[PDB]
Amino acid sequence: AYDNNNIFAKLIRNEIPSVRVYEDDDVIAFMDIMPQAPGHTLVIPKKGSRNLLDADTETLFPVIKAVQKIAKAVKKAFQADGITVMQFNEAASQQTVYHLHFHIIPRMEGIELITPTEILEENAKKIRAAL
Amino acid sequence: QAYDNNNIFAKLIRNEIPSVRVYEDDDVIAFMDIMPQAPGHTLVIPKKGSRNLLDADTETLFPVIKAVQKIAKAVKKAFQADGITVMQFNEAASQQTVYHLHFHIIPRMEGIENNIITPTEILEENAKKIRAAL
Known part of the structure; x- marks a missing residue:
């Protein structure tokens, strides 16, 4: 069952x-406070579910719209060569926080896949500007 | 860049x-998927063409994500999977290989971490399981 006490709630x-x-x-x-690349952003619904498997379907529409909006902005903000979107379900897919979240990770040509708040804030300002 | 109407998914x-x-x-x-990363690995595509997520119509994403959820659930049941990994790749640097929007739906098993084509007959046996789990 979904636990309202999880960190993203x-x-x-x-x-x-x-x-x-x-x-x-x-x-x-x-x-993301544990970014896989500079500008690694997470998108979550405000309505809680463990992951994709238990989410109300109507919840998914605003989530995927925002994932798209964020992918575009992240790419533009960091002039990234690519964007990787990931969404993990259960321990075996390396899900660790049990609240639905999509990863948006910028990618650079030739680069294979804990950060202080000040650096994440520098990066966020760039993403905000590119929206 | 222009969408390639000759891409294999189109x-x-x-x-x-x-x-x-x-x-x-x-x-x-x-x-x-004909070169699956795990048995039952399924792809979901829009019928409406876009290179990837970035150039897709936002309206297209709704039926896509609904079907991604529906498939994630069917694949996990059909294969008694411990987990489901969903991936979506935009551009060469994200290892996108076919330039049409597609989501990967990959079943995971606890503690189980190519260009090898899986024979069509085997994909079918896997498809039937998924079809029954929908």
């Missing part, structure tokens, strides 16, 4: 800080 | 090459 409730790049009625986009 | 959509399809509606096709 706490984030939604402003219980912990985040470095946000986009927010609306349905979603929050914010910097 | 050709699949127009019925110019065969596929092992597991699901289809007015907007999408789900079909077996």
